[PDB]
Amino acid sequence: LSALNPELVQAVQHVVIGPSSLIVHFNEVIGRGHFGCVYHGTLLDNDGKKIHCAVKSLNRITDIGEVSQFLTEGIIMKDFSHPNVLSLLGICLGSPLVVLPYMKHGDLRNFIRNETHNPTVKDLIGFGLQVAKGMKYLASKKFVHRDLAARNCMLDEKFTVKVADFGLARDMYDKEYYSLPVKWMALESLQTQKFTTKSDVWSFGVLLWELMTRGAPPYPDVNTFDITVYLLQGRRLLQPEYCPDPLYEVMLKCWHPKAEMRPSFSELVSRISAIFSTF
């Protein structure tokens, strides 16, 4: 730790959580191992208020070169703050730690799939509008997500959706064993391996479809290899049973073959809030 550049150490100070500010409960995992080694933690603020948090041990980082790089992704993610984006509470310098807020209802996909939960069409559209608000913010900062899907959004105790699985919160589903999300990808990303805000808009379209079907898998009868030819033929996901026609018009616009013809996230927020307001 002494070996790190002093000007870089000074730069990351605002992101660092001191060991006397955090109680990590290494004896209790969050979400029955489905999110890897994520533990409950208690973070103390400047006034001593207790904050329930989720603590991820970043096992991939070993050498000083990697520590220095992760320190930069921390500085960048710390500047990202919005009600519909998962915030980075801080980092701890064994393994470096990533401290994230605790999300009572886990991931959005599992929540909408759970038989015991009964969100209305309005509630589902509200979740979609929340995701659109989070993405409008990321897009405003020229940040391209590359893996937007319902499994990658989280829900807190107030049912606020937080876009996640980006920056230091990426590989959210990395499970350890002892022995590309092509169905959410824009046609041009499948052909070029390049990603833009316009390819996030296509992905948002599929997540909208996921919300309106209460988490059904997209294109269940189509192989990942066959998705390109299927999309090139002009075939698209069909209108869900309980989905308003203007909302399906929105989804279809997200899947337009010409990237420039797709709505921006600011247009999606405008259009979806107008639809939400009719309920």
Ligand SMILES: Fc1cccc(Cc2c[nH]c3ncc(-c4cnn(C5CCNCC5)c4)cc23)c1
């Ligand atoms: F972008 C990320 C990067 C790394 C990790 C993570 C995961 C993560 C962060 N904060 C969390 N806070 C709570 C839960 C969680 C899991 N399951 N549950 C409930 C669900 C209802 N049943 C009881 C358990 C709550 C998971 C997380 C995200």
